[PDB]
Amino acid sequence: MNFYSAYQHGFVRVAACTHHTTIGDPAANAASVLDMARACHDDGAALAVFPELTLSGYSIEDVLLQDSLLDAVEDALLDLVTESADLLPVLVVGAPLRHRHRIYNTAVVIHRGAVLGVVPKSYLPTYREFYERRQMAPGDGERGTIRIGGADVAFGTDLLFAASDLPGFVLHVEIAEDMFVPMPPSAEAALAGATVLANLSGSPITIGRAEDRRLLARSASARCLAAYVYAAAGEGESTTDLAWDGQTMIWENGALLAESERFPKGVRRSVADVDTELLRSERLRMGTFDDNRRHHRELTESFRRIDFALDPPAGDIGLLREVERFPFVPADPQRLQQDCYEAYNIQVSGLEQRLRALDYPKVVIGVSGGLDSTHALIVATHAMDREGRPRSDILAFALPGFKNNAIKLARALGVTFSEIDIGDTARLMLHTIGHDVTFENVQAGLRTDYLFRIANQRGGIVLGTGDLSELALGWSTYGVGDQMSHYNVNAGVPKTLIQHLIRWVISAGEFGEKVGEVLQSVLDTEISEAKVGPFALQDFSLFQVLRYGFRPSKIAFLAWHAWNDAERGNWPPGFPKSERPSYSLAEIRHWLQIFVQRFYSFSQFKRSALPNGPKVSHGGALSPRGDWRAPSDMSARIWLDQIDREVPKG
C-alpha cells in the first residue's frame, strides 16, 4: 500500500466550482466549465459540482423557451460529454433539457465520456423573486429514461451514483430549492445510501441569504451524516433584477471543510478531501439513522443505483484537509473558551448532584501539586460554593512518601489542609511482604487506603483525579491505588485539555488573584511521557479510536499530517515556540504500537471497575457503563499486525 495516498485512506477529493456565466451562450459556458474541470482533474478530484442551469445561465427567464437556446445547450452538453473521456472527475453540470412535454431544470451527471444520469429539480419556487414554474416542469415523481445524444440514460429524482472501486462514495444530486423544503430529496437519498450530497444552486444573493444557505447545507450534512457540496452562480448572471455572489462550499457531518470568496472577480473553486471513513463510522454507530431508513423502507428501497469506476490517482497528492493536532483542544480561541466553559460546568454540576444526594458529605482529596489534583480541587471548591457549603468541608491532604503549590493553593482557597506522611506505613508494609512496581504501588495504594479511611472516619467521600488519557492507557494503580475513588471529576477530561481548563479558571478570575497566582505557578512548574509516550499523540489516537474506530494506519496518516510540521496548521493558545514539537512518522508509529497494545489489550480491566463521574467530550468517555464496552481479556495482535504491514518504518 501507498501510505501517502489520500485515496488509499478512504478520502475522496471533491470540488464545488463557480464558473463564468455568459447568459444565453451555452458554448461559452461549456468552455468555462471545461477549463475548471481540467483543473479539478489536475487536482485529482473525483467530483466537480457546477451551478444551477450552468449551460444556459439561470437568470434568462423566457429565453429558456427559445428553440435556438435549447438547441445550443444540447450541442454544448454533448461536446462536454465527449471531452470528459479524458477527465478524472464525475462532472455534475446544470442544463435546461427537454423531456416529454416540457423542459426540466436538470443536473447532468457526466463521467468519462458518458452521461450516467439526468436529475431534474423537484421543487420550483414561484414566489417573491422566483418564477421557475413559468418555464420549467417539476421533476418530483419522474422516473424512467431520457434520450441524450442517441442514448437512453436514467432520468429522475431517485438516482444514486456509486463508485464501484470506492464503496464509501455514493453520490446523490439535488437542486437549489430542493434543499429548503421540510422533506428534501437528499434526506431520503442519505437513508438509501448516499454519502455525498451535491447541490447545484442559482441563488440570487440577498441580505441574509448566505446565512440561510449555510444553516441548511450544514444541518443537512449533520442530519444526514454526509458530505454536502454546494455551488452557486456568480459573475455573468443577469442583473436586470438580481445580484449574485458565486458562493461555493463543502460541509462534512456539520463541519465546514472549505468555502470560497463571496463576490469574487474571476472563477472560484472549493476543493476538499472528504473522509468517507468518518461518515461510514458515524453511520455504523448511530443505530437510529438506520431505524429511520427502515421506517421509510418503501421510499428508501426504490432508488436506482448507477455504477461507475472512478480509478483515482494512487500516488501522493497531499491532503486537502485541516487536521488539528489536538482533537480535544480547538485551535480557535473562541471555540476553546466555549469548550472550557462547558467542560468545567460538567465536572462541577456532576459533583454537585453526587454531594446533594449524599446529604453534603465532606470531600476528601489528595493534593500533590500536580495539574490533575489541582484542577480537581478547584472543581470541588466551586461545587461547594454553588451548594452553599463551607469550604472547610473540603479535606485536602498532602501524602508524601519517598507541592508547596499544594499547601499554598489549599491555604489560598481556605479549605481544610493537612499532611500525612505514608512512609512509615509503607516501610512496615514492604517489610511484612518481604520486599519497581511493587515499591511504587505500595505507596500509591497506601495513599488511597488512607483517604478512604479518613472518608469513613470523617463522613466524607474520596474524590478521584485520574484523567481520561490515564484511563485510556492504564497508567494508574488498579483497585488499591489512584484508579479507585468515590467520585471521579477528571475521568472524562483528557490530559491535553486539563491545562487549558486551569488557564481558563485563571483568566476568568472569580477565585481571586492569590488563587490565580498559585494556579499560574502550578502551570509554570508542571509543564511518564517517558514510557507511554507524549500525551499529545496518545490523546490524538484516543479520539480516532473512541469516536470513529479508525484502523491504525489511518490514525498514523492523520497524526502525521497534523504533527509532522510545526509551522503548518494552528496551535491552540498557550504554546510558546520552544513547546511546539513536530513528530516524525517513525515516532508516531512507535507510540501508536504502544497505544494499541495498551488500549485494546492491557488496560480495559482497569476501566471495567470504574468509579462514577460525568462524560465530558463529544469524543466520548471510557466508562464501561457508557461509551466503551470491551473485553478485559483480549489481545491486540491484529492492530499490531496492521501497523506492521501498512505503516512504513519511517
Ligand X SMILES: Nc1ncnc2c1ncn2[C@@H]1O[C@H](COP(=O)(O)OP(=O)(O)OC[C@H]2O[C@@H]([n+]3cccc(C(=O)O)c3)[C@H](O)[C@@H]2O)[C@@H](O)[C@H]1O
Ligand Y SMILES: Nc1ncnc2c1ncn2[C@@H]1O[C@H](COP(=O)(O)O)[C@@H](O)[C@H]1O
Closer to ligand Y by CB, 29 or 490: give it.
490
**What's the min distance (Å) between Cβ of 563 and ligand X?**
23
3-state secondary structure 403-423: CHHHHHHHHHHCCEEEECCCH
The listed partner (ligand Y, its own copies, ligand X, none) that binds 576, CB under 5 to 8 Å by sort, is: none
Q: What is the rounded end-to-end Cα distance, in angstroms, of the chain?
A: 14
Closer to its own copies by CB, 109 or 484: give it.
484
- Which residues, 120 to 159, sit near ligand X by CB under 6 A? none
The listed partner (ligand X, ligand Y, its own copies, none) that binds 614, CB under 5 to 8 Å by sort, is: its own copies
The one-letter code for the residue type at 643 is I
Closer to ligand X by CB, 1 or 358: give it.
358
Phi, psi for residue 232 in degrees, rounded to 5: -105, 160
Distance of alpha carbon 265 from the chain centroid: 32
Alpha-carbon distance of 252 to 234, in angstroms, equals 23
Choose, by CB under 6 A, the member of 84, 106, 476, 544 that binds ligand X: 476
The listed partner (ligand Y, its own copies, ligand X, none) that binds 474, CB under 5 to 8 Å by sort, is: ligand X
Integer CA distances (angstroms), 11 to 276, 319, 614, in order: 6, 9, 34
From 246-254, 308-316, 454-462, 547-555, span contacting ligand X (CB under 6 A): 454-462
- Which residues, 89 to 128, sit near ligand Y by CB under 6 A? none
- Which residues, 569 to 598, sit near ligand X by CB under 6 A? none
**What's the min distance (Å) between Cβ of 316 and its own copies?**
22
- Which residues, 482 to 511, sit near ligand Y by CB under 6 A? 482
Q: Which residues of 178-188 are buried (b: 16+ CB within 10 A; e: fewer)?
A: bbeeeebbbbb
The listed partner (ligand X, ligand Y, its own copies, none) that binds 366, CB under 5 to 8 Å by sort, is: ligand Y
Q: What pairs with residue 174 in β-bridges?
A: 199
- Which residues, 484 to 503, sit near ligand X by CB under 6 A? 486-487
Q: Does 94 bind ligand X (CB under 6 A)?
A: no
Largest Cα–Cα distance in the chain? 101
Closer to ligand X by CB, 456 or 570: give it.
456
Q: Which three cell numbers stand for residue 166?
A: 470506492
Q: Which three cell numbers stand for residue 91?
A: 462532472
**What's the min distance (Å) between Cβ of 619 and its own copies?**
8
Q: Which residues of 304-339 are buried (b: 16+ CB within 10 A; e: fewer)?
A: eebebebebbeeebebbbebbbbbbbbbeeeebbeb
Closer to its own copies by CB, 5 or 448: give it.
448
Q: Which three cell numbers stand for residue 210?
A: 448566505
Choose, by CB under 6 A, the member of 81, 231, 272, 398 that binds ligand Y: 398
Within 10 angstroms of residue 150's Cβ, the number of other Cβ atoms is: 6
- Residues in contact with ligand X, counted by CB under 6 A, come to a total of 24
- Long-range CB contacts for residues 330-333, cutoff 8 Å, separation at least 24: 330/572, 331/569, 331/570, 331/571, 331/572, 332/570, 333/572, 333/573
The DSSP element (H or E) to which 366 belongs, if any, is: strand 362-366
Q: Does 353 bind ligand X (CB under 6 A)?
A: no
The listed partner (its own copies, ligand Y, ligand X, none) that binds 469, CB under 5 to 8 Å by sort, is: none
Assign 491 to helix, strand or coil.
Answer: coil
- Which residues, 454 to 483, sit near ligand Y by CB under 6 A? 465, 482
The listed partner (ligand Y, its own copies, ligand X, none) that binds 385, CB under 5 to 8 Å by sort, is: none
Q: Does 399 bind ligand Y (CB under 6 A)?
A: yes
How many residues belong to the chain? 650
Contact 6/273 with Cβ under 8 angstroms?
A: yes
The listed partner (ligand X, its own copies, ligand Y, none) that binds 398, CB under 5 to 8 Å by sort, is: ligand Y
Convert residues 359-378 into a mask of x (bound to ligand Y by CB under 6 A) and - (unbound): -------xxx-x-xx-----
The listed partner (its own copies, ligand Y, ligand X, none) that binds 428, CB under 5 to 8 Å by sort, is: its own copies
The one-letter code for the residue type at 156 is G
Convert residues 427-446 into a mask of x (bound to ligand Y by CB under 6 A) and - (unbound): -----------------x--
Convert residues 518-547 into a mask of x (bound to ligand X by CB under 6 A) and - (unbound): ----------x-------------------
Angle at alpha carbon of residue 599, lines to 465 and 3, rounded to 5°: 130
Alpha-carbon distance of 58 to 163, in angstroms, equals 30
**What's the min distance (Å) between Cβ of 437 and ligand X?**
5
Integer CA distances (angstroms), 34 to 20, 28, 81, 87, in order: 11, 10, 10, 10
Convert residues 387-426 into a mask of x (bound to ligand X by CB under 6 A) and - (unbound): ----------------------------------------
**What's the min distance (Å) between Cβ of 620 and ligand X?**
21
Contact 353/385 with Cβ under 8 angstroms?
A: no
| Residues followed by a gap in the chain, C→N > 2.5 Å | 402, 435, 527
Choose, by CB under 6 A, the member of 125, 400, 534, 569 that binds ligand Y: 400
Contact 450/420 with Cβ under 8 angstroms?
A: yes
Closer to its own copies by CB, 243 or 314: give it.
243
* Residues of the shown chain interacting with ligand Y in the complex, contacts defined by CB under 6 A: 366-368, 370, 372-373, 398-400, 444, 447, 465, 482
Interacting residue ranges for ligand X, rule: CB under 6 A: 358, 361, 437, 440-441, 444, 455-456, 460-461, 470, 474-478, 481-482, 486-487, 528, 605, 632-633
